[PDB]
């Protein structure tokens, strides 16, 4: 049996540093999705996200410690129901956490009274849960959807087997080579983008739902990006939003979220349904893309910064990151925001199930380095993949001036006239 905490007691503890309020619902509900039809979505202000889904992860206890949840803390759990928290509460006590309570009245008591403060990811509806995609493809009535034309796009890099081995029913595949050039690894020209989108069946008023499949990329392989399909999906989300597709969504966690939800997959090679006209000028959102001239200006500007989203070995010039990148080093003056272990993983921006990391954690880490929304930020990496996923996260927070410096280290280091640093920074 677990101690219950009351709505009155919890309100009195919202500012306490020894209390940890923990939301055990899905990360999508935490971000704002009204998964039970609640009028106010999101989480209790100050709450951390610890989906009960993660209880089967053998590294669950390390996830808790990585989140700085300590046995000395007073732990308060809540879900859609107090029964959601039963297994989480037991797990905490089994591991030395002795001050554990459950808040039974989150929904509808906390959600249904405007005096109880809540928080949410400001643009959460661009990061969709698997159930929303399911309702969309099934024709059901879904929230955050007022359109009549949609397309589910399975993204991959020169690896149609990632799609053919299993995809969301009805979805078509988009190779990333369709929207970015193998010469520069930058977005293609507007004329090419228009034709590529028309040929995949996408207009500017189509709701595009992008996802990819994670297939454990290996640095030994000639094309590790063929296994990092959901980064590629978010890369294509960047390019489509830059081009002018008004409603682009990303399935949170990619393909794993679809199968984790127990939904049926397909292996059909769905043929494309061309559309004659994209229906808008390209690019409609040029401010999302930054090129090297503007990137050099942003380095000299106080109002702006470049944000290096690469690994630490790349940052110190120990490796180039990719086998087509010649020079090792970093762009001087950029702010480091370590992506993860290498050029094809995003561990610092992702949970183990590949859903986006708790956005408050991304926010506080970014703020510790002066990465803040009042600036104009251009995220970049090797060629713009990882920078797109970083950019997308900031966009989801409603940050007003965030861009991707497309050329990245590849374009920067290809010009020997450009300066660069190496080694551990002094
Ligand atoms: C598809 N791509 C443009 C050829 C890149 C994408 C990428 C991911 N990480 C880095 S660096 N580049 C790759 O797969 O290396
Ligand atoms: Cl729903
Ligand atoms: Cl390969
Ligand atoms: Cl991925
Ligand atoms: Mg607290
Ligand atoms: Mg690029």
TrEMBL record:
<keyword id="KW-0479">Metal-binding</keyword>
<feature type="binding site">
    <location>
        <position position="43"/>
    </location>
    <ligand>
        <name>Mg(2+) 2</name>
    </ligand>
</feature>
<feature type="binding site">
    <location>
        <position position="16"/>
    </location>
    <ligand>
        <name>Zn(2+) 1</name>
    </ligand>
</feature>
<feature type="binding site">
    <location>
        <position position="119"/>
    </location>
    <ligand>
        <name>Mg(2+) 2</name>
    </ligand>
</feature>
<dbReference type="InterPro" id="IPR001763">
    <property type="entry name" value="Rhodanese-like_dom"/>
</dbReference>
<feature type="domain" description="Rhodanese">
    <location>
        <begin position="15"/>
        <end position="267"/>
    </location>
</feature>
<feature type="binding site">
    <location>
        <position position="274"/>
    </location>
    <ligand>
        <name>Mg(2+) 4</name>
    </ligand>
</feature>
<feature type="domain" description="Rhodanese">
    <location>
        <begin position="309"/>
        <end position="421"/>
    </location>
</feature>
<feature type="binding site">
    <location>
        <position position="298"/>
    </location>
    <ligand>
        <name>Mg(2+) 5</name>
    </ligand>
</feature>
<feature type="binding site">
    <location>
        <position position="360"/>
    </location>
    <ligand>
        <name>Mg(2+) 2</name>
    </ligand>
</feature>
<dbReference type="GO" id="GO:0004792">
    <property type="term" value="F:thiosulfate-cyanide sulfurtransferase activity"/>
</dbReference>
<feature type="binding site">
    <location>
        <position position="360"/>
    </location>
    <ligand>
        <name>Zn(2+) 2</name>
    </ligand>
</feature>
<feature type="binding site">
    <location>
        <position position="19"/>
    </location>
    <ligand>
        <name>Mg(2+) 1</name>
    </ligand>
</feature>
<keyword id="KW-0808">Transferase</keyword>
<dbReference type="InterPro" id="IPR051126">
    <property type="entry name" value="Thiosulfate_sulfurtransferase"/>
</dbReference>
<dbReference type="InterPro" id="IPR036873">
    <property type="entry name" value="Rhodanese-like_dom_sf"/>
</dbReference>
<feature type="binding site">
    <location>
        <position position="383"/>
    </location>
    <ligand>
        <name>Mg(2+) 3</name>
    </ligand>
</feature>
<feature type="binding site">
    <location>
        <position position="301"/>
    </location>
    <ligand>
        <name>Mg(2+) 5</name>
    </ligand>
</feature>
<feature type="binding site">
    <location>
        <position position="19"/>
    </location>
    <ligand>
        <name>Zn(2+) 1</name>
    </ligand>
</feature>
<feature type="binding site">
    <location>
        <position position="305"/>
    </location>
    <ligand>
        <name>Mg(2+) 5</name>
    </ligand>
</feature>
<dbReference type="GO" id="GO:0046872">
    <property type="term" value="F:metal ion binding"/>
</dbReference>
<keyword id="KW-0677">Repeat</keyword>
<feature type="binding site">
    <location>
        <position position="406"/>
    </location>
    <ligand>
        <name>Mg(2+) 3</name>
    </ligand>
</feature>
<feature type="modified residue" description="Cysteine persulfide">
    <location>
        <position position="381"/>
    </location>
</feature>
<feature type="binding site">
    <location>
        <position position="186"/>
    </location>
    <ligand>
        <name>Mg(2+) 3</name>
    </ligand>
</feature>
<feature type="binding site">
    <location>
        <position position="185"/>
    </location>
    <ligand>
        <name>Mg(2+) 3</name>
    </ligand>
</feature>
<feature type="binding site">
    <location>
        <position position="119"/>
    </location>
    <ligand>
        <name>Zn(2+) 2</name>
    </ligand>
</feature>
<feature type="binding site">
    <location>
        <position position="16"/>
    </location>
    <ligand>
        <name>Mg(2+) 1</name>
    </ligand>
</feature>
<keyword id="KW-0862">Zinc</keyword>
<feature type="binding site">
    <location>
        <position position="304"/>
    </location>
    <ligand>
        <name>Mg(2+) 5</name>
    </ligand>
</feature>
<feature type="binding site">
    <location>
        <position position="43"/>
    </location>
    <ligand>
        <name>Zn(2+) 2</name>
    </ligand>
</feature>
<protein>
    <recommendedName>
        <fullName>Sulfurtransferase</fullName>
    </recommendedName>
</protein>
<dbReference type="InterPro" id="IPR001307">
    <property type="entry name" value="Thiosulphate_STrfase_CS"/>
</dbReference>
<dbReference type="Pfam" id="PF00581">
    <property type="entry name" value="Rhodanese"/>
</dbReference>
């Amino acid at each position: 049996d677990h101690t219950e905490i009351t709505t009155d007691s919890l309100l009195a503890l919202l500012g306490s540093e020894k209390v940890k309020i923990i939301d055990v619902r899905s990360a999508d509900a935490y971000n704002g999705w009204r998964m039970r039809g609640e009028v106010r979505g999101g989480h209790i202000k100050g709450a951390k996200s610890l989906p009960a889904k993660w209880l089967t992860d053998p590294e669950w206890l390390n996830i808790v410690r990585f989140k700085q949840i300590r046995p000395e803390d007073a732990i308060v759990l809540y879900g859609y129901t107090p029964e959601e928290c039963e297994q989480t509460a037991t797990r905490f006590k089994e591991n030395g956490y002795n001050n554990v309570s459950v808040f039974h009245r989150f929904h509808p008591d906390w959600t249904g009274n405007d005096a109880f403060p809540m928080d949410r990811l400001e643009q959460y509806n661009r990061l969709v849960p698997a159930e929303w995609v399911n309702g969309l493809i099934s024709g059901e009535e879904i929230p955050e959807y007022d359109n009549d034309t949609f397309i589910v796009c399975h993204a991959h890099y020169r690896n149609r087997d990632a799609y053919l081995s299993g995809h969301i029913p009805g979805a078509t595949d988009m190779d990333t080579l369709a929207l970015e050039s193998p010469e520069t690894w930058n977005r293609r020209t507007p004329e090419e983008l228009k034709k590529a989108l028309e040929e995949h069946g996408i207009t500017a008023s189509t709701t595009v739902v992008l996802y990819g499949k994670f297939m454990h990329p290996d640095n030994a392989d000639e094309f590790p990006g063929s296994a990092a399909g959901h980064i590629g999906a978010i890369r294509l989300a960047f390019i489509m939003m830059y081009a002018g597709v008004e409603d682009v969504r990303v399935l949170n966690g990619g393909y794993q979220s679809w199968t984790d939800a127990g939904f049926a997959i397909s292996k059909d090679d769905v043929p494309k349904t061309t559309v004659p006209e994209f229906g808008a000028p390209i690019p409609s959102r040029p401010e999302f893309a930054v090129d090297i001239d503007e990137a050099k200006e942003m380095l000299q500007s106080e109002d702006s910064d470049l944000v290096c989203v690469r690994s630490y070995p790349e940052y110190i010039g120990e490796v180039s990151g990719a086998n087509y990148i010649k020079k090792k080093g970093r762009i001087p003056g950029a702010i480091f925001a370590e992506c993860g272990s290498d050029a094809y993983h995003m561990e610092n921006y992702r949970n183990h199930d590949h859903t986006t990391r708790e956005y408050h954690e991304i926010e506080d880490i970014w703020a510790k380095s002066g990465i803040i929304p009042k600036k104009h930020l251009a995220f970049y990496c090797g060629t713009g993949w990882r920078g797109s996923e970083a950019w997308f996260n900031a966009l989801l927070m409603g940050w007003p001036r965030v861009s991707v410096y497309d050329g990245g280290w590849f374009e920067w280091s290809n010009d020997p006239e450009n300066p660069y640093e190496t080694g551990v920074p002094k």
